[PDB]
Amino acid sequence: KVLTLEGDLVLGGLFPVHQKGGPAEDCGPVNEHRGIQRLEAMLFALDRINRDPHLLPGVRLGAHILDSCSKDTHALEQALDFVRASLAPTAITGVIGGSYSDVSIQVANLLRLFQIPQISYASTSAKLSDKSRYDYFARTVPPDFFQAKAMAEILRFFNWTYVSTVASEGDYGETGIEAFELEARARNICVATSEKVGRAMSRAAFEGVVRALLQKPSARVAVLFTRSEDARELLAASQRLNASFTWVASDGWGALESVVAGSEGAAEGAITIELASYPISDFASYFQSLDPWNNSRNPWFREFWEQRFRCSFRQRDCAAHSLRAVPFEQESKIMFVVNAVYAMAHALHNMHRALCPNTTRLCDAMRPVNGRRLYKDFVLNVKFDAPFRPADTHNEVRFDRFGDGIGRYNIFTYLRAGSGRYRYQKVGYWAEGLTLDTSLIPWASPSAGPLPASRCSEPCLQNEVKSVQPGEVCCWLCIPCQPYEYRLDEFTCADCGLGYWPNASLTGCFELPQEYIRWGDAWAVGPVTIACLGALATLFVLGVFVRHNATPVVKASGRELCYILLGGVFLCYCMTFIFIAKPSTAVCTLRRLGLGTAFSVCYSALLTKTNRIARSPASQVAICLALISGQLLIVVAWLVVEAPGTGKETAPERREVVTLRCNHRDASMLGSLAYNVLLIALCTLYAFKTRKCPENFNEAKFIGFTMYTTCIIWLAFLPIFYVTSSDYRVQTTTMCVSVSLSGSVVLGCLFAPKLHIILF
Amino acid sequence: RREIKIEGDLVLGGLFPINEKGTGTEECGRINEDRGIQRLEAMLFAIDEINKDDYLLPGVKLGVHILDTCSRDTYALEQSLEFVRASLTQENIPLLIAGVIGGSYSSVSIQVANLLRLFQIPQISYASTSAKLSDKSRYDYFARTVPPDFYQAKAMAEILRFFNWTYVSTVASEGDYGETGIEAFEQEARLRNICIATAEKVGRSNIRKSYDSVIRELLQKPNARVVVLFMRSDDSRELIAAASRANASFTWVASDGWGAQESIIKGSEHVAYGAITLELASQPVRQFDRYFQSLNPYNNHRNPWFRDFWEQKFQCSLQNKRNHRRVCDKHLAIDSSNYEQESKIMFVVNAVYAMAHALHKMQRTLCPNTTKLCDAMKILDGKKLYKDYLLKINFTAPFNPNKDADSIVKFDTFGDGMGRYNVFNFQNVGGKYSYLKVGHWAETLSLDVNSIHWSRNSVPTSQCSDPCAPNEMKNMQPGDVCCWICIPCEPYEYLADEFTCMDCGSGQWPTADLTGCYDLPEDYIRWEDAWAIGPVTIACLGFMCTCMVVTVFIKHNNTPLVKASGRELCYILLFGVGLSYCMTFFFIAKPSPVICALRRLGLGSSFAICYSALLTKTNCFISPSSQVFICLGLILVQIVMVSVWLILEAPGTRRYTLAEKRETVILKCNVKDSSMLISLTYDVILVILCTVYAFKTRKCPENFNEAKFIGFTMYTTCIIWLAFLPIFYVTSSDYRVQTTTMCISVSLSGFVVLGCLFAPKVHII
Ligand SMILES: CC(C)CCC[C@@H](C)[C@H]1CC[C@H]2[C@@H]3CC=C4C[C@@H](O)CC[C@]4(C)[C@H]3CC[C@]12C
Ligand SMILES: CC(C)CCC[C@@H](C)[C@H]1CC[C@H]2[C@@H]3CC=C4C[C@@H](O)CC[C@]4(C)[C@H]3CC[C@]12C
Ligand SMILES: CC(C)CCC[C@@H](C)[C@H]1CC[C@H]2[C@@H]3CC=C4C[C@@H](O)CC[C@]4(C)[C@H]3CC[C@]12C
Ligand SMILES: CC(C)CCC[C@@H](C)[C@H]1CC[C@H]2[C@@H]3CC=C4C[C@@H](O)CC[C@]4(C)[C@H]3CC[C@]12C
Ligand SMILES: CC(C)CCC[C@@H](C)[C@H]1CC[C@H]2[C@@H]3CC=C4C[C@@H](O)CC[C@]4(C)[C@H]3CC[C@]12C
Numbered sequence A: 001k002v003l004t005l006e007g008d009l010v011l012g013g014l015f016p017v018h019q020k021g022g023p024a025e026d027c028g029p030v031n032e033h034r035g036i037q038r039l040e041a042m043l044f045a046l047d048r049i050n051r052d053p054h055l056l057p058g059v060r061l062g063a064h065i066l067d068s069c070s071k072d073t074h075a076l077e078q079a080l081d082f083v084r085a086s087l088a089p090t091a092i093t094g095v096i097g098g099s100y101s102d103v104s105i106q107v108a109n110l111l112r113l114f115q116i117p118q119i120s121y122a123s124t125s126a127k128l129s130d131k132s133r134y135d136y137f138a139r140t141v142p143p144d145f146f147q148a149k150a151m152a153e154i155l156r157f158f159n160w161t162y163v164s165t166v167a168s169e170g171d172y173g174e175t176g177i178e179a180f181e182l183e184a185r186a187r188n189i190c191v192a193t194s195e196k197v198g199r200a201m202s203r204a205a206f207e208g209v210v211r212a213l214l215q216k217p218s219a220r221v222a223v224l225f226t227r228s229e230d231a232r233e234l235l236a237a238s239q240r241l242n243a244s245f246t247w248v249a250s251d252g253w254g255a256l257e258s259v260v261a262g263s264e265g266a267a268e269g270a271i272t273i274e275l276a277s278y279p280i281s282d283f284a285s286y287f288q289s290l291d292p293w294n295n296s297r298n299p300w301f302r303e304f305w306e307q308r309f310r311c312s313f314r315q316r317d318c319a320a321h322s323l324r325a326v327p328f329e330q331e332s333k334i335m336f337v338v339n340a341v342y343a344m345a346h347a348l349h350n351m352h353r354a355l356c357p358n359t360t361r362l363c364d365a366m367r368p369v370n371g372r373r374l375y376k377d378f379v380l381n382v383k384f385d386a387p388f389r390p391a392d393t394h395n396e397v398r399f400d401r402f403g404d405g406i407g408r409y410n411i412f413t414y415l416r417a418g419s420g421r422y423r424y425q426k427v428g429y430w431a432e433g434l435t436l437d438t439s440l441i442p443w444a445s446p447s448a449g450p451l452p453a454s455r456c457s458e459p460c461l462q463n464e465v466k467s468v469q470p471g472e473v474c475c476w477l478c479i480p481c482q483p484y485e486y487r488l489d490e491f492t493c494a495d496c497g498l499g500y501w502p503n504a505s506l507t508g509c510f511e512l513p514q515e516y517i518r519w520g521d522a523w524a525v526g527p528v529t530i531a532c533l534g535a536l537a538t539l540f541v542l543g544v545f546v547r548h549n550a551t552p553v554v555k556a557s558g559r560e561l562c563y564i565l566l567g568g569v570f571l572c573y574c575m576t577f578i579f580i581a582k583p584s585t586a587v588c589t590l591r592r593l594g595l596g597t598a599f600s601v602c603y604s605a606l607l608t609k610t611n612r613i614a615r616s617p618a619s620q621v622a623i624c625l626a627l628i629s630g631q632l633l634i635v636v637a638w639l640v641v642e643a644p645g646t647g648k649e650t651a652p653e654r655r656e657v658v659t660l661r662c663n664h665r666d667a668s669m670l671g672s673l674a675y676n677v678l679l680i681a682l683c684t685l686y687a688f689k690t691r692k693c694p695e696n697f698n699e700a701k702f703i704g705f706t707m708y709t710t711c712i713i714w715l716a717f718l719p720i721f722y723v724t725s726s727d728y729r730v731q732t733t734t735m736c737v738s739v740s741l742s743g744s745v746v747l748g749c750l751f752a753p754k755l756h757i758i759l760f
Numbered sequence B: 001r002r003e004i005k006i007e008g009d010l011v012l013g014g015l016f017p018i019n020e021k022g023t024g025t026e027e028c029g030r031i032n033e034d035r036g037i038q039r040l041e042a043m044l045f046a047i048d049e050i051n052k053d054d055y056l057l058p059g060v061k062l063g064v065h066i067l068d069t070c071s072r073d074t075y076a077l078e079q080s081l082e083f084v085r086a087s088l089t090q091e092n093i094p095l096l097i098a099g100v101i102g103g104s105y106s107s108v109s110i111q112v113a114n115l116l117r118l119f120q121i122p123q124i125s126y127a128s129t130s131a132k133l134s135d136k137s138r139y140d141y142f143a144r145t146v147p148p149d150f151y152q153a154k155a156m157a158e159i160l161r162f163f164n165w166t167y168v169s170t171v172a173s174e175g176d177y178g179e180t181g182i183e184a185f186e187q188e189a190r191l192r193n194i195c196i197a198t199a200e201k202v203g204r205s206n207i208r209k210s211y212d213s214v215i216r217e218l219l220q221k222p223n224a225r226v227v228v229l230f231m232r233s234d235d236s237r238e239l240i241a242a243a244s245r246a247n248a249s250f251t252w253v254a255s256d257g258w259g260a261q262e263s264i265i266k267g268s269e270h271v272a273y274g275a276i277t278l279e280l281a282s283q284p285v286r287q288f289d290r291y292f293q294s295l296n297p298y299n300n301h302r303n304p305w306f307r308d309f310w311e312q313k314f315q316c317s318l319q320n321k322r323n324h325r326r327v328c329d330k331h332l333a334i335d336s337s338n339y340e341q342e343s344k345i346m347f348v349v350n351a352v353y354a355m356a357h358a359l360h361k362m363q364r365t366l367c368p369n370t371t372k373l374c375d376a377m378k379i380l381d382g383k384k385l386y387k388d389y390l391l392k393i394n395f396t397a398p399f400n401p402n403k404d405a406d407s408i409v410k411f412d413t414f415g416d417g418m419g420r421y422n423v424f425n426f427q428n429v430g431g432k433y434s435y436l437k438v439g440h441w442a443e444t445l446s447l448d449v450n451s452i453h454w455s456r457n458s459v460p461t462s463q464c465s466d467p468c469a470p471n472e473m474k475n476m477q478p479g480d481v482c483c484w485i486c487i488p489c490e491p492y493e494y495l496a497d498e499f500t501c502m503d504c505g506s507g508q509w510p511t512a513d514l515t516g517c518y519d520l521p522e523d524y525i526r527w528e529d530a531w532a533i534g535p536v537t538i539a540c541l542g543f544m545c546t547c548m549v550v551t552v553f554i555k556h557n558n559t560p561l562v563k564a565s566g567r568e569l570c571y572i573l574l575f576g577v578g579l580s581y582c583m584t585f586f587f588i589a590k591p592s593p594v595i596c597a598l599r600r601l602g603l604g605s606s607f608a609i610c611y612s613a614l615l616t617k618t619n620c621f622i623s624p625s626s627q628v629f630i631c632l633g634l635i636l637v638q639i640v641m642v643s644v645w646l647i648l649e650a651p652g653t654r655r656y657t658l659a660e661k662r663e664t665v666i667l668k669c670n671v672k673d674s675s676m677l678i679s680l681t682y683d684v685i686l687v688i689l690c691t692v693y694a695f696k697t698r699k700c701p702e703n704f705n706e707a708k709f710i711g712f713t714m715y716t717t718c719i720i721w722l723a724f725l726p727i728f729y730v731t732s733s734d735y736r737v738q739t740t741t742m743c744i745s746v747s748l749s750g751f752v753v754l755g756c757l758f759a760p761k762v763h764i765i
């Protein structure tokens, strides 16, 4: 059966009037909502256009509507009539049809070769957008990647990055998940589990997939892009397993009550989206006021009446029923059918205006209707107000550059009313951006967590480091680094140290020079006292040798020997002062030279005292100078053997032990000091053994006592230096006090009684 | 309309360009004798042979439903609906079509395949070579016995690679064949690393200036002689004519558009000489020749286009109804004189036989034990016939009993025929110009260089450069990416990259190209040299002499008790002389370590000691001792601020030179030479100024020796200072300045020690 209407321009149509038949027949039962309602909507739209003075006042739009029987193979042989008419056939200017995606694809493939524009009303396939295969296909409904983007925006709005997408096994679901994954990874959204759901999957398989979803505790949100039956089975399995999830579903779920049928306990909190549309007031009145007696245009109306109302036309008993009494549920795609018909009519009107300006009717320039110009220049470039629009809504009908509709979806939530009833309530819309109100969602109210699916783990980027990957790319495990492990980059902690803590820089370990090289005033007071005592001793010696030449006692002894003894005391004081000074390479060399010279002059004084006791001043001076030269040679040999350095390292956590002492080991210096001390002790022992006591008795006794005290001090200060092995400050203080005691002994030795006698 | 509708058990469709396309009222006009009549008769002859065959479909008779296309897409699409009208659920009963042997035009084949893919009807083309038809996602029921057009772009790319032709010029043509070919050849060249110099485009306007511009653009590049052509016949002819008019000479490597055609070399055989062209491999069919030569308008009733073809070929009319044409002779016939076999007759026969073999295998497999049309074959599923049986054929050419290895008919995974091409070289004989087959490309390259003319002496076409060794030979890229110039860099620079020489080290030579970034061994370390050993011996002899003089003075200090302070003055003078002598031995140190600072300190101390000794003698028991103590304190202070000079930088920073070859520097004693010379010169001039006053002053006869010694020393110091500074100030030699300075210092020390010891030497003797 063919629905044909007379008119100047014929518009093709294709509707799924009959359902799939199978092996028994090509097509069987008549569709009541997708086949009859949409066909009547198209007829109503054509009637309104023909009765519209402002839309084709002279040109009357005809109709050539066929039945696809919900099958693509039948659709091709049905659509092999428009091409025959183009080649009594009536030439058409374009078809307005195609509900199923496969039927629309086949019709677009067939009609592309013959330049016949096609405007679909219910085909949302994502593979119909490329113009490399469909040169004349347009649609009013938006494709599925728009709702995938809407779901991605919804996920980003609630800061849900750890999701778990669930797909389907048929042609619906694979492309949607493939398109959603790219937009999710472009919006920093992490997918945990991805699987496919089949129609043949039994209850055990659904239980297994629910268990697999539950295998991730941190993934409490699931992005469902499946069919209605698969969603219903999944909710049933989740209720059976007592699983809790925040489901974000596509138009497959929408606001249908069949999915939540018998599973109302687990569907709470689901954020489902649906294609936005409004009912048409005029279409309801037009359809309800239809009867088989006063409707002869529709050839399938009698079969629809027989199927919907249980009766037969053989017996006069079908006149009692009426569509007015029974409730009428408007199909959600009626809007799109009317919009497609009006878009085609407006494109035809615009092309007629641009091709037949003077005349108000069909002109000779439009006797052949070419699909190329009408599609490329007119069909795509339509911008008109939608017919039968609501009172204050602003729907607009237009096409993109792929010939697709404008993505406008409604966001629905499965609320739990206080009365106990479960209902769907709209909580926003998605035209170009998400517009959630967050006021009607039950779990959006301020509470202890609005189902936060943050991530696999809590990100750490304030002060810690996040570089541990347990197996997931975007799972961030943060472990605070050690205080000495200063943060230098995002994936490593530098081993520069703890004392070099960056000052809110975290770049290169900005060094902190806050180190205790030496005590400036906390402990230098004692060293200051030692230096003052040394200066006082030097001044006393300076006053001493002025009258030394006059004094016969000093004159009898070596005046040069007394002068070099005073110089050695001054050298000891200077060595103490330089030890008190801050350590450095030059400072370390100066201290080593000072201690070596002090030991050398002490040994020379002991040797010349022994020589004087045994027995000349020139020989003693030469001997002491040779000894000093040899000591200086060995000191400089040690200095060149082990070079001095600065920079000390210690334990972490701000030890502040840097620059404690020169980086050159003093084992050789200590050995040389011990050797010269032993030589001085041997000289003192020889002097004591010598029996020259009767002559120069007081001075000899003083020298012997001084030597004994120096030896005792050395033998008592060796164990403490050996045992301390640390505490550089205390070691320096001990060395300073030892050298001060040595200088005090030197000044109180035989030189002091001679000065006292001279004064008295 | 006219059509062939021979009935049979199985019917095969047919699409041929019998009529040439036209404009206006006439959709298609003149009969195409070669591509429309010969191919149609070849298909009919193949069908008759298959029907008469006893091994191929013995119980099944093959019918034909052959239509026209008029060499246009729309009319062929309009007639293609008859092939699918029979598969839909009395004036003209339709015939079920198993497959369509149609094609001969890329656009027509594309449209027919688009229409037929919706109804599951296999199609085998015999002439369409478009690369777009290889996309099985858009044409999943299409096959062809001819290879696509991008096989030539591989064959002649391999030809170019064989002769090491890497930097060639490519010329294409406007349309689809020329483009698809030029991007295919560019892809193959980039795969084989062949550079493209220029890419010209030629339109169909046949402008007399565009061709000359293209020739000039090709000619303004003397290092690219091989030219690659993807052009149609007339465009290539116009380009060759323009090249001949411009007196150019190139090595053309063309595609099947040129082939072995004669209309291109007409009047321009000079420039076209030596060109290498590809032609599709095709063999004549003698059986088809016999079948076609025995065709007459009175016995060939199956063909409705034969009357028009006969009238157009012989320019006569069988039924002259007052027409302006002669009456066709009853004895007129077509023979080899006026008929030549078309190049794709064998391809048409192969396509028909491939369809027949696919149907035969399907009939054998589906219903065995019988030879007839079965009930299972009534549905005639096209998907199973194409994807399973048609694409898996393997059979030799039916009318090729000579060759059996290169005559296998089969389709690859994309449903395309095997790519076999013949390489033709345009050569001369001595006055006659003709094409000669010098090779063959069937998935492999095989040429005969000996028989090739003008390319046996292969034209050198390198990649815009020559291979240059990496021995400091930088490769700088000009505006063309493939070109190289191989410009040298500095010899001291060590190569590290390709686009730059990337010098490493300041004064270090490389080893081969990169590894020589290490420090260059300095030549300053030269111990026991010719000019080093001698100064050491001189210094040792001077030190020994000074020690002997000191010992003699010590021995001669007892009896002369008057010199209470003279002995001390002699001792300190000897000590200063020895210190100076040791300082001279310090500068000759070949390693030149950081101890050069201590050497500086020793030299300064020696200079201060000499100055103090000179001042003490000029001034002259307790008072002399006080003067000696003051001089010692002054020397200590002098050493103090001499060491203050080292409180800034003892070793230094670095010592470089303008020469990038030797770089013989100490590298650890690079202190300020100018500052050192200024500090050293101050002491000498101060000593000279202090000693000149004493020389003019009148001294006592007993003390006249001191004044004479001071005067003698004053002259030597000024000469030494004047000689030392200029050499090291500017030249700054590695070791020549050091040895001269040491020699001057030791000579001055010897002079002063002789001056101060002449009197004791005479007194001792
Ligand atoms: C730089 C420091 C460390 C040097 C320490 C030793 C100094 C003070 C000593 C070493 C040798 C000493 C000299 C030795 C002999 C004499 C001769 C005498 O008739 C006067 C004192 C005099 C001139 C001495 C002065 C002091 C002296 C220079
Ligand atoms: C034998 C003794 C008494 C002679 C007089 C003291 C000598 C040894 C002292 C006095 C001044 C000192 C110098 C002072 C400063 C520096 C700079 C430093 O970066 C390296 C060491 C160096 C170069 C010292 C070397 C030793 C030095 C020359
Ligand atoms: C008898 C007396 C006067 C000899 C004095 C010798 C002095 C001047 C010499 C002997 C050893 C020398 C040191 C040996 C090694 C180094 C390390 C180097 O990186 C800087 C210089 C420095 C620190 C030298 C400075 C000068 C030095 C201290
Ligand atoms: C007798 C006096 C006047 C002169 C000789 C004594 C002094 C200056 C000599 C004696 C031994 C010498 C050292 C012997 C060996 C070396 C190692 C060499 O790699 C650097 C120089 C160095 C470190 C020498 C420096 C100068 C030195 C310390
Ligand atoms: C050269 C370096 C290594 C050492 C420092 C110089 C030494 C050897 C010099 C400097 C001053 C000199 C002294 C100066 C004066 C006198 C008084 C005289 O009646 C005897 C020699 C005597 C006591 C000298 C001995 C050598 C001496 C101590």
Ligand SMILES: CC(C)CCC[C@@H](C)[C@H]1CC[C@H]2[C@@H]3CC=C4C[C@@H](O)CC[C@]4(C)[C@H]3CC[C@]12C
Pocket (backbone or CB within 6 Å): B543, B582, B585, B586, B589, B591
């Ligand atoms: C002690 C009396 C007799 C004076 C003689 C001093 C002699 C022995 C001293 C003075 C200067 C010295 C030299 C100074 C520096 C160096 C460079 C070093 O890398 C090796 C040792 C060498 C080459 C020394 C060898 C000994 C030396 C020549």
Ligand SMILES: CC(C)CCC[C@@H](C)[C@H]1CC[C@H]2[C@@H]3CC=C4C[C@@H](O)CC[C@]4(C)[C@H]3CC[C@]12C
Pocket (backbone or CB within 6 Å): B579, B582, B598, B601, B602, B605, B606, B632, B633, B635, B636, B639
């Ligand atoms: C041995 C070679 C390397 C030369 C080393 C330098 C010598 C000659 C220098 C360096 C430091 C100098 C000493 C520095 C200070 C004094 C104190 C003064 O009151 C008497 C001279 C005296 C004691 C100097 C004698 C000479 C001296 C030892």
Ligand SMILES: N[C@](CC1c2ccccc2Oc2ccccc21)(C(=O)O)[C@H]1C[C@@H]1C(=O)O
Pocket (backbone or CB within 6 Å): A034, A099, A100, A101, A122, A123, A124, A125, A126, A171, A172, A226, A227, A228, A251, A252, A333
């Ligand atoms: N717009 C739909 C979308 C359709 C679909 C929607 C939800 C669940 C499964 C499902 O099956 C597929 C598979 C592939 C492409 C589109 C779909 C169309 O048929 O194109 C369908 C509402 C239109 C109608 O049939 O009236």
Ligand SMILES: N[C@](CC1c2ccccc2Oc2ccccc21)(C(=O)O)[C@H]1C[C@@H]1C(=O)O
Pocket (backbone or CB within 6 Å): B035, B104, B105, B106, B127, B128, B129, B130, B149, B175, B176, B177, B178, B231, B232, B233, B256, B257
């Ligand atoms: N085999 C061809 C190749 C053909 C072609 C060959 C040489 C020069 C120009 C040219 O024009 C185009 C343009 C696009 C694609 C193919 C071609 C085909 O039509 O596919 C054509 C010889 C076959 C025939 O028409 O009988």
Ligand SMILES: *[C@@H]1O[C@H](CO)[C@@H](O)[C@H](O)[C@H]1NC(C)=O
Pocket (backbone or CB within 6 Å): A157, A158, A159
């Ligand atoms: C998501 O995070 C943003 C900040 O990145 C915040 O402003 C917003 O309130 C969050 N949404 C919630 C908590 O629902």
Ligand SMILES: *[C@@H]1O[C@H](CO)[C@@H](O)[C@H](O)[C@H]1NC(C)=O
Pocket (backbone or CB within 6 Å): B162, B163, B164, B458
């Ligand atoms: C091409 O080069 C190869 C080696 O680079 C050489 O063996 C071959 O003979 C060359 N072909 C020519 C010069 O035709």
